[PDB]
């Protein structure tokens, strides 16, 4: 199976450069161009350019003629996008992608997960996780909403699951908001009142940038 593997995230100081990797497998690397695409948080897809691994020759979109440098390592089947002298406005997800077929009308059928590049002077910091437990409640069949509040981390992303992914329906995980160079987000889950607290509900918060996972058990207060 075709795979394009990208790191989840890169934190880059303003004015520095970064080399993004795209490790390809499941196909013959020299049979296709590698293309790259940017997406700033609330915007659309913007093409950066593409490279022929056989001769190192590339095309670039106008906005990236100097911002971006494409190379490959044919031996290890890795494509690299070097982003030069970044500013906060270069914060964005960067995807690698390749055509499904080699015809010159082929569309881009395979996409990496995309690397979230954060351009910032702030330091990586793990999240604090706080339980959101309901107060007293009658013995009725009204559903129970629980949650967890995640504060004080940097950079994005954090992911949240419940009961290690077992509790998947009735979950809302809200977009992070940035304050004082720290992110805050929250997640809620609604369960039948017949279950919790006899059945435990734990939120699992993953922060790959700090290599940290926090598993907060929601306990009646």
């Amino acid at each position: 199976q075709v795979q394009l593997q990208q790191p989840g995230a890169e934190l880059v100081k303003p004015g520095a450069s970064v080399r993004l990797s795209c490790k390809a497998s499941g196909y013959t690397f020299t049979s296709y161009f590698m293309y790259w695409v940017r997406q700033r948080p609330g915007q659309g897809l913007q093409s950066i350019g593409g490279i022929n691994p056989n001769n190192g020759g590339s095309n670039f979109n106008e906005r990236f003629k100097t911002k971006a440098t494409l190379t490959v390592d044919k031996s290890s089947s890795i494509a690299y996008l070097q982003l030069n002298s970044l500013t906060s406005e270069d914060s964005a997800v960067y995807y690698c992608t390749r055509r499904g077929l080699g015809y010159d009308y082929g569309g881009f059928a395979y996409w990496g997960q995309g690397t979230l590049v954060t351009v910032s002077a702030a330091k990586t910091t793990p999240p604090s996780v706080y339980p959101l437990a309901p107060g007293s409640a009658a013995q009725t069949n009204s559903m129970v909403t629980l949650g967890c509040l995640v504060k004080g981390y940097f950079p994005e992303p954090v992911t949240v699951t419940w009961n290690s992914g077992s509790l998947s329906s009735g979950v809302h995980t809200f977009p992070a908001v940035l304050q004082s160079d720290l992110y805050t987000l929250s997640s809620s889950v609604t369960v039948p009142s017949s279950t919790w607290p006899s059945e435990t509900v734990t939120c699992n918060v993953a922060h790959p940038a700090s290599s940290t996972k926090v598993d907060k058990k929601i306990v009646p207060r």
């Binding site: 196909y27 013959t28 296709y32 080699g102």
Partner: peptide, 9 residues
Amino acid sequence: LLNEEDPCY
């Protein structure tokens, strides 16, 4: 020699 599989080529 080129381990080619794509019908185009």
